[PDB]
Design goal:
By secondary structure, the protein is α+β, with helices and mostly antiparallel strands. The protein has a single domain, classed as Alpha-Beta Plaits (2-Layer Sandwich), CATH 3.30.70.330. The protein is 19% helix and 29% strand. A 4-stranded antiparallel sheet has the order 2-3-1-4, with helices on one face. The longest helix has 7 residues. The protein starts with a strand and ends with a strand. It comes from Helicobacter pylori (strain ATCC 700392 / 26695) (Campylobacter pylori). This is Ss-DNA binding protein 12RNP2. InterPro entries: Nucleotide-bd_a/b_plait_sf, RBD_domain_sf, RRM_dom, SLIRP/GR-RBP-like.
């Protein structure tokens, strides 16, 4: 069970939207996010806990550039 690190997360980009599907294709065990550290709002980055099988490709085809929840700057924690 590795840990994934994704940044460039907005109030409601897609991270919290994909977490629902990530369980059907990735079966995420633990998924959380951070806050602005001032307004208690989601803005900065997030986290994801998954096995050591989906994490390999999870960032492979995902991480690259900044899009509308299509790639984002993700990487192994």
């Amino acid at each position: 069970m590795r840990n994934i690190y994704v940044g460039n997360l907005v109030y409601s980009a897609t991270s919290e939207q994909v977490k629902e599907l990530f369980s059907q294709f990735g079966k995420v065990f633990n998924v959380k996010l951070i806050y602005d550290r001032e307004t208690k709002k989601p803005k900065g980055f997030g986290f994801v806990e998954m096995q050591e099988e989906s994490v390999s490709e999870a960032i492979a085809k995902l991480d690259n550039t900044d899009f509308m929840g299509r790639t984002i700057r993700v990487t192994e924690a």
